[PDB]
């Protein structure tokens, strides 16, 4: 209730090997399903802290109410807070109140539109890992979310940007990028997740290339205040 209100949509992440849902990404929405950008547009510098806290409690509260028993992935605001130990208490308290294990919460980090801070994000990531949270680098291969992040700290998961996934079955350059990045992730013991999968052709190439966790319209669109079920076409095909 920081001048405005909002809620969450949820989008499944699928394990294409086991054909089970690994979890859901929480995606901020307006009360009448207005887009995430229109909500985040209302966030200013005096909002960052309070807005980020509301996102986590809303996602946890909604996911618990909806009966989510797999992972809950929450986007971490790009700049926002410096100190990592203080006001995470409200996240820990919410997780306790809704009986949602910390180990089932993943935070997605996409650096910023800022310079070579990186040591800023690193200590946040390593502190969250120390409490039991899962961590992901988001939008890998776009913007400031790249190899510079990976060089200084490693998350549990790397979500590869949809720009690199698009039409990968037909794009030899994207094929070479992904094959070498998958070997990199394997060397670093990082689990890849392909984001923005829109067609069976992308899915099949990515699955053959070794990706298991995937997300995208091909599986299910984000669901307003709900947990969407997943497309049956991928599990048989």
Ligand X SMILES: Nc1nc2c(ncn2[C@@H]2O[C@@H]3COP(=O)(O)O[C@H]4[C@@H](O)[C@H](n5cnc6c(=O)[nH]c(N)nc65)O[C@@H]4COP(=O)(O)O[C@H]3[C@H]2O)c(=O)[nH]1
Contact with a second copy (CB under 8 A): which of 41, 97, 163, 170? Answer: 163
Does residue 202 interact with ligand X by CB under 6 A? no
- When asked if residue 35 is in the footprint of a second copy (CB under 8 A), the reply is no
What gap in Å lies between CA 136 and CA 129, rounded to an integer? Answer: 10
Rounded to whole angstroms, the Cα distance separating 227 from 71 reads: 12
Give the residues across from 15 on adjacent strands. 20, 213
Restricting to residues 76-105, name those near ligand X by CB under 6 A: 76-77
> E strands within 16-156?
20-29, 71-75, 105-109, 134-140
Residue 138 annotated as binding? yes
CB 12 within 8 A of CB 24: yes
Which of 16, 27, 54, 206: binder of ligand X (CB under 6 A)?
Answer: 27
Instruction: Kindly identify the residues of this chain, within the stretch 112-141, that bind ligand X according to CB under 6 A.
Output: 138-139
- Rg for the chain (alpha carbons), in Å? 17
- Binding residues for Ca ion, per CB under 5 A? 75, 108, 138-139
Q: How many residues bind ligand X (CB under 6 A)?
A: 23
User: Are the C-beta atoms of residues 228 and 207 closer than 8 Å to each other?
Assistant: no
φ, ψ dihedrals at 99, nearest 5°? 55, 45
List the x/- string, 164-193, binding to ligand X by CB under 6 A: ------------------------------
Binding region for ligand X (CB under 6 A): 11, 26-28, 35-36, 40, 52, 55, 75-77, 110, 138-139, 162, 196-198, 215-217, 222
């Amino acid at each position: 209730s920081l001048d405005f209100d909002f809620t969450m949509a949820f989008q499944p992440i699928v394990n294409c090997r086991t054909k089970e849902i690994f979890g859901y990404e929480a995606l901020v929405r307006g009360l009448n399903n207005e887009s995430a950008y229109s909500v985040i547009s209302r966030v200013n510098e005096d909002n960052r802290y309070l807005f980020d806290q509301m996102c986590r409690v809303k996602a946890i509260a909604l996911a618990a109410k909806l009966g989510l028993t797999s992972k809950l992935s929450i986007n971490f605001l790009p700049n926002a807070i410096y100190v990592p130990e203080r006001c995470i208490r409200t996240t820990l308290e919410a997780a306790k109140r809704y009986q949602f294990p910390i180990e089932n919460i993943m935070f997605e980090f996409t650096e910023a539109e800022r310079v070579e801070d990186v040591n800023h994000i690193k200590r946040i990531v390593e502190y969250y890992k120390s409490l039991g949270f899962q961590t992901a680098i988001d939008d890998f291969g776009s913007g400031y979310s790249g190899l510079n992040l990976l060089a200084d700290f490693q998350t549990n998961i790397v979500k590869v940007d949809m720009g690199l996934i698009r039409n990968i079955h037909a794009d030899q350059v994207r094929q070479s990028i992904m094959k070498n990045c998958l070997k990199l992730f394997s060397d670093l013991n990082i689990q890849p997740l392909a984001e923005g999968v829109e067609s069976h052709a992308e899915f099949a190439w990515l699955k053959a290339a070794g990706v298991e966790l995937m997300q995208g319209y091909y599986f299910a669109k984000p669901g307003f205040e709900s947990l969407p079920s997943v497309n049956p076409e991928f599990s048989e095909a």
